[PDB]
Amino acid sequence: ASTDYWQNWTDGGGIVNAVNGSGGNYSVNWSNTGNFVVGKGWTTGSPFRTINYNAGVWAPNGNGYLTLYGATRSPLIQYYVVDSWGTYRPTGTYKGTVKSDGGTYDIYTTTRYNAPSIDGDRTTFTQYWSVRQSKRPTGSNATITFTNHVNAWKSHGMNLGSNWAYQVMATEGYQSSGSSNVTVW
């Protein structure tokens, strides 16, 4: 019943100094990055899991997100529950709203795609988002009741796969600097 997964990915831009701390704790310090994601969680996500965290440091300097992040497979769908951010509040195609864990979240979709073929053929992967309307306070224990997002998403036609991949409480950055320290359970 413990976290069992560590994600530390960068596109190779700038500096991402991620520390896989003991137990559920991690930290990141980053400088002049491209895109990166770091986080702790579980190798297999669940729609029933309540993700707990306590972010002792949330200090983006530019564009960064403090977000639940996971995927389901076949085809790959990414999802996010964004509790706090830096300069940029992530948005996309607006679907509606959900209230969870003391916050109100806007629901969006976005898309990405795999490298196009020689002929310009593309395969997409979609992202489901809940994004808090205002930044959540950090430094005390927080819950993300993921089922509430799963259910609201379903009501907007945003269905996840039965095939669960990683599920993490993440620090993500894009073209930015910052630091974070987060404990997950």
From Swiss-Prot:
Enzyme Commission no: 3.2.1.8
Reaction(s) this enzyme catalyzes, per UniProt: Endohydrolysis of (1->4)-beta-D-xylosidic linkages in xylans
GO molecular-function term, one example from the UniProt record: endo-1,4-beta-xylanase activity
Keyword Hydrolase attached: yes
PROSITE patterns to which the protein is assigned, alphabetical: GH11_1 (PS00776), GH11_2 (PS00777), GH11_3 (PS51761)
Keyword Signal: yes
Active-site residues, Swiss-Prot/TrEMBL: 78, 172
Coiled coil (UniProt feature): none
Domain GH11, chain residue ranges per copy: 1-185
InterPro entries: ConA-like_dom_sf (IPR013320), GH11/12 (IPR013319), GH11_AS_1 (IPR018208), GH11_AS_2 (IPR033119), GH11_dom (IPR033123), Glyco_hydro_11 (IPR001137)
Annotated disulfide bonds: none
Top-level lineage group: Bacteria
One GO term (biological process): xylan catabolic process
Pathway(s) annotated for this protein in UniProt: Glycan degradation; xylan degradation
Keyword annotations: Carbohydrate metabolism, Glycosidase, Hydrolase, Polysaccharide degradation, Signal, Xylan degradation
Family of this protein: Belongs to the glycosyl hydrolase 11 (cellulase G) family.
Protein name from the UniProt record: Endo-1,4-beta-xylanase
Gene: xlnA
